[model samples]
Target: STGSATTTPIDSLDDAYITPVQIGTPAQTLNLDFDTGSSDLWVFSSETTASEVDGQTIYTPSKSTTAKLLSGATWSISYGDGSSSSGDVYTDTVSVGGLTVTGQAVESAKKVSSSFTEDSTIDGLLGLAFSTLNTVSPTQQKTFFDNAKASLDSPVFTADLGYHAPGTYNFGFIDTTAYTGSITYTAVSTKQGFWEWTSTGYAVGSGTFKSTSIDGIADTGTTLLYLPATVVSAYWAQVSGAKSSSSVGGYVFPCSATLPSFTFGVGSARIVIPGDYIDFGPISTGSSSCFGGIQSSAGIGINIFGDVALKAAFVVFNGATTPTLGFASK
Candidate 1:
């Protein structure tokens, strides 16, 4: 499913979540979080000064003899959480799982905060989503997938997260065998540049709370299922004792309750959000421990149906097709 994404390293933390990809010959490895939200590949580098990196794994260019720098160019990306990273750019002969690609653009953070520079996980980010938000400037930038896609045997990439254990994120050309069939896709608009869709309606449990109606764009970059206040209140009203909580960042209710199933219609597809994911966790706030499911978006703009809603459905992004989007079950 497409939504926002993060990570760590070491067997204790690493074995549980870290997945490594080779970026150069002899397999120089990078531990990366398979982020479904934004589609950009970034890596922390040893060359980065202390103030510019964060609690993320950092890479060392000296480790790769073939690394090349993109002189005079700087790159920076800011995330939804207000955290940001900036650094100089470079290129390298990157290889993953024995697959090699020359001149893959990489950003080397010169000054990163401790929040991003200190993780022990493998190192860097390998974004496998579409081509809209890529930082490799078209004038001087080349993407990890754009350059490698042509040479890969399959020309497609796949992310397999572990159900029992946090699974590793793998990439290469797409393997047709791994997916059920020829992928269903949606085209992209040049204006927004993110995989977007208008939610026709919403549902919960077996109840169809809202009739099919067109809504706004849905982003994988967001982590929660943000809805309009009117819609959120309507759904919450259905729950017997559902009420707002101040302790949690969002809405909270009884975790064990037989919560209503929620779905957002995209064209003809009705993507559902499982009940177990409702009232997420015991967040600090309010008197009673609040539920994790729905929350009030009194001030936020756009009705974002984040990962909380995507995890239950299979999603595909084909930027090659204009206005492209496709969802199904795995």
Candidate 2:
């Protein structure tokens, strides 16, 4: 079996990608963030407090004939950005694109953080990471991908993110037309419950490759790319008027400054990031200082190849017994 879904960015900068998902028999369609960093499919539901509801869509399980409580099961997840959500568990018939999965765990949020409440962009998050990262207590629940991969034709899912347009996510098989050249496959480390891989090296603009291996996770959920302090400093130094600001909290540069492209290695392949992608956006509305898409991961503890890096090329999350990641240019 196979399935596909179009992922639209919530913002023009592609801060996050939202995909439509149908929950329940009657199908309450909600645009959700398909996050590969975490492993718990949670949502805003009727049970979410009125104070935390804001203007987002709510999933009402009571109206669904196929919805059933998972007994005492409950879940809570906190993101690196400090956003969080906690809720009761309910099993329902959930469908994405044309793929259907009955008895899929749909965590209904009883409470959500302020950030989640204020952002009306995404209704919830569907985790594609390993099930080991699931926050459900007593009995950990499997991720939507883990549950559905067993019946898939080839047990793989692909993420084709867009720069300023809608992209796609295909399951069970790879679409030949979606990418160009050869697909570069790399081993993945699932011990951390992420699609973690080690890059052979990187280069700034048209510079030579720095043959140092860097370990990081390909987190589609995160908004920016985080590398080591050394790499970040090296890149920012090349741009005039760029500096690490104390008040702004990251590497910021003039909006009019000349930007340089970034390139990183994945196995034997090298993916190029256009200069515009590194500029990110303005530090504040109508401000001259723009934040950089690539930042130092020194404070984060883990390097994250977020949307800023992922959008540069086509990506594959293979769930074979050993598990692997595939990358290709488009």
Candidate 3:
């Protein structure tokens, strides 16, 4: 059977998106970030330290009759942003949208980094990447999608992330009505456990689209768009007051500056990002400076088409045979 769920933005527009997920026998619900960058279904649980719980909701596995401890199995994960969580493992009933997966691996957090502890809105993460990247020790675990794929009409899912609005994540089937124009299909390299692909090139404002093969991953968990340093420099050079600030960490410019549009080449299809979306709000609260949503991914090696870029189009993540990505305007 096919399944679909609504994803709501966390902050204004560029922060993150959250979806409701049900866990355990009685069905305890929690808001989880459907992260495509990693593989591990982890949540803040009763096992977490009281100091790390903060104001976030906690999942008490003891309340669920179906929750079973996985003996000595444990897990630990770290993000590119230095955020991390480590915990014990449990086999439980997990459901997303209308899809249910029995005996799904649920990593219950016993420790969390300050970055995760501070974010009280998100209770956990639902990893959508390949199961090979799962962090569970001794025995790796499969994600909700992997376990439910066999029951789906088709092993595919579509991401329709929006700008300051609610979007939908459709599983097992693609809804043609959700997008405009024809979807451009591109091959993806899953060797790295990510939706990795090469962009044909990019362009600034209305400039010509250059021809270059930039390897990157389409990550929904990442909040900002990250490209090569030289590419970022070229884009910022067009903005008069834009500069890379050490304090703010990334390209910062006057909030009043009128930015230009940006576009990325995916095969023959051109995905354009509007100018207003470039300025990712203010650098800090009550600050006149704003950080550019498109920053340098030089430190990370691969480029990241995060929320900023994904919000501009409808994305389809196909899992059948060789993984492929399809894009269209929303």
Using lDDT, give the best candidate's number.
Answer: 2
lDDT of 2 by residue, 1-330 (tens): 888999999987888999999999799998899999999999999999999887889899999999999999989889999889998999998888888888999999999999999889789999999999999987999988988998889999999999988999988999999999999999999999999999999999889999999999999999899999999999999999999987988999999988999999998899998988777789889998999999999979999999989999999999999999999999
**Model 2: lDDT to the true structure:** 0.92
lDDT (C-alpha) at residue 91 in model 2: 97
Clashing pairs in 2: none
| Pairs in steric clash, model 3 | none
Instruction: Give the better candidate number (1 or 2) by lDDT.
Output: 2
Candidate 1 vs 3: which has more TM-score:
3
Per-residue lDDT of 146-250 in model 3, one digit per residue for the tens? 898899999998899988889988899999899999999898999999999888999999899888988999999999889999889989999989999988888
Greater TM-score among 1 and 2 belongs to 2
RMSD of each: 5.1, 0.7, 1.0
TM-score of each: 0.76, 0.99, 0.98
* CA lDDT, every model vs. true structure: 0.55, 0.92, 0.91
Q: Model 1 misses residue 70 by how many Å?
A: 0.8
TM-score for candidate 1? 0.76
